[PDB]
Amino acid sequence: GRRVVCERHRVVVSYPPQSEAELELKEGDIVFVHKKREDGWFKGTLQRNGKTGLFPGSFVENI
């Protein structure tokens, strides 16, 4: 019941970052979601490169 801050997701649609605040997503990447924002952007950390940043939530799916 305690907050989930490391929720495992898979990237469904690749996303190129518009700035350094954003994460590059590649299809198939594993991303751990720390926060889902009211504006629909997620904060998470990629397993592949260890980077933390913001990305559009609709581009990922729960595992």
Numbering used by the authors: 826 to 888
Reproduce passages from the article:
Our data therefore suggest that the conformation of the aromatic ring at position 526 is determined by steric interactions dictated by the size of the surrounding amino acids.
We therefore hypothesized that SH3 domains of group 1 have eclipsed conformations, whereas group 2 have staggered conformations. To test our hypothesis, we determined two crystal structures of SH3 domains of the scaffold protein POSH (‘plenty of SH3 domains’), for which the first SH3 domain belongs to group 2 and the fourth SH3 domain belongs to group 1. POSH-SH3-4 shows a similar structure to JIP1-SH3, with an eclipsed conformation of the corresponding phenylalanine residue (F867) stabilized by CH–π interactions from V858 (position 517), K861 (position 520) and G882 (position 541), and by π–π interactions with H834 (position 493).
